[PDB]
Amino acid sequence: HDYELIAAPLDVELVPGFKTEAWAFGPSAPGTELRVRQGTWLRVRFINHLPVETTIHWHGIRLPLEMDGVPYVSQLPVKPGEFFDYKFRVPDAGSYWYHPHVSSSEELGRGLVGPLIVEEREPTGFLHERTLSLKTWHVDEQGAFMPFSVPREAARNGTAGRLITINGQAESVTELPAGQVVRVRLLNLDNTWTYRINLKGNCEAKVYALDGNPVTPRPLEDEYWLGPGMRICLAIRIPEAGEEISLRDGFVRLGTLRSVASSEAPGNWPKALPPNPIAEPDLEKAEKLNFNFEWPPSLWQINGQAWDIDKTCADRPIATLKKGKSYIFELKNMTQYQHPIHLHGMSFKVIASNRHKITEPWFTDTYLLGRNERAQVALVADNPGTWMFHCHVIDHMETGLMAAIAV
């Protein structure tokens, strides 16, 4: 599977009837959609027609280290009118995404994000799917860009996005079936906003995976909090036709789901997603240390106490890990705010905690850590060397809420 790709500085009509001076991954930004079979070292040549350097981070995604879009011993930072060969095996089925790991506030903020369907090689029980690609843009009322870094907004829960965009569309008109189940690849791809999601309106609705990394089929539920660098592969039995089902964030009119007609029979409930083969950790055998949290210009958002810029580029060994050995992490949120703690490279299972309490443990690349929460996450050092790891509230990362570890 061998592929193209512009980083095209695209003027596109974002604000209905207006400008917008943006940097897309080709067209239809948030990015162009990626489909690969679960296998082929996915061949791609990145392209820059933009004025400055940019990687491509394969979020969650557990590639050969070099490839992870991660500056300096992994890959050094690709330039304007230049390319790097992007090539990697695809282990983690279901929705992942892509986006830089450079000056990212600005970069992603200007549209540098996009999805990554990873076609489960098992014939998807779902007849029909769809992609529902969430960002909310740092744009003023005229389309021109609001700042991406905002100190007192960002030193609390993150810098303010504004415009509500699925596939880059405010008020989405995604058209659907009379009777069939539908796969609902929902991707939070925002910088900063942590989205509090529900369904009102008349329909049946079930989930299958989360953050690509599947599990059993839990349904409709309370408002499931979705974080930056989180996703949710999920299903909807839209009823018999008509109903424009209200997609919401708590109350908030996000998108709309026109139930359109079909001369066709029902695509009744698929049996559970066959979970991803992952760093399956041994329970009693692992060991443990911990941290996150605190509050001198640049982030004052301290990391198990370790500034970050001595840690700028090389490594003051912020953690020291061994290959193939199973392992465990306590996480304390210490500042009066909430952080979506992400990982590359590997993807992890969760065990037990405070805020939510644990029925079936779940795989994901990113854990969504609440205030004073102390959650037991666990995996094994599957992939090698220096992997990156950090508060995916992009701003919280940017200048000093990042840290990392090797194998």
Tokens of 237: 């039995």
Nearer to Cu ion among residue 110 and residue 392 (C-beta): 392
Number of residues that bind Cu ion (CB under 5 A): 6
Give the span between the Cα atoms of 293 and 333, in whole angstroms.
6
Least distance from Cu ion to the Cβ atom of residue 158, Å? 6
Mark the segment that binds Cu ion (CB under 5 A) among 52-60, 111-119, 122-130, 184-192. Answer: 52-60
Tokens of 323: 């290959």
Residue among 396, 398, 404, 405 that touches Cu ion (CB under 5 A)? 396
Give the span between the Cα atoms of 369 and 339, in whole angstroms.
5
Q: Is residue 59 near Cu ion by the rule CB under 5 A?
A: yes
Nearer to Cu ion among residue 62 and residue 110 (C-beta): 62
Mark the segment that binds Cu ion (CB under 5 A) among 131-139, 187-195, 288-296, 384-392. Answer: 384-392
- Rg (the chain; Cα; Å): 20
Q: Is residue 62 near Cu ion by the rule CB under 5 A?
A: no
Cβ neighbours, 10 Å, residue 68: 25
Max CA pair span of the chain: 65
Nearer to Cu ion among residue 178 and residue 306 (C-beta): 306
Residue among 339, 377, 394, 404 that touches Cu ion (CB under 5 A)? 339
Q: Is residue 391 near Cu ion by the rule CB under 5 A?
A: yes
Q: Which residue has the tokens 């512009």?
A: 6
Give the span between the Cα atoms of 316 and 336, in whole angstroms.
28
Q: Is residue 393 near Cu ion by the rule CB under 5 A?
A: yes
For residues 197 and 226, is the Cβ–Cβ distance under 8 A? yes
Determine which helix (DSSP H) or strand (DSSP E) holds 36, and give its type and residue range: strand 35-37
Mark the segment that binds Cu ion (CB under 5 A) among 23-31, 216-224, 343-351, 353-361. Answer: 343-351
Least distance from Cu ion to the Cβ atom of residue 222, Å? 22
Q: Is residue 344 near Cu ion by the rule CB under 5 A?
A: yes
Q: Cis before residue 30, ω within 30 degrees of 0?
A: yes
Query: Which residues sit at the interface with Cu ion, rule CB under 5 A?
Result: 59, 339, 344, 391, 393, 396
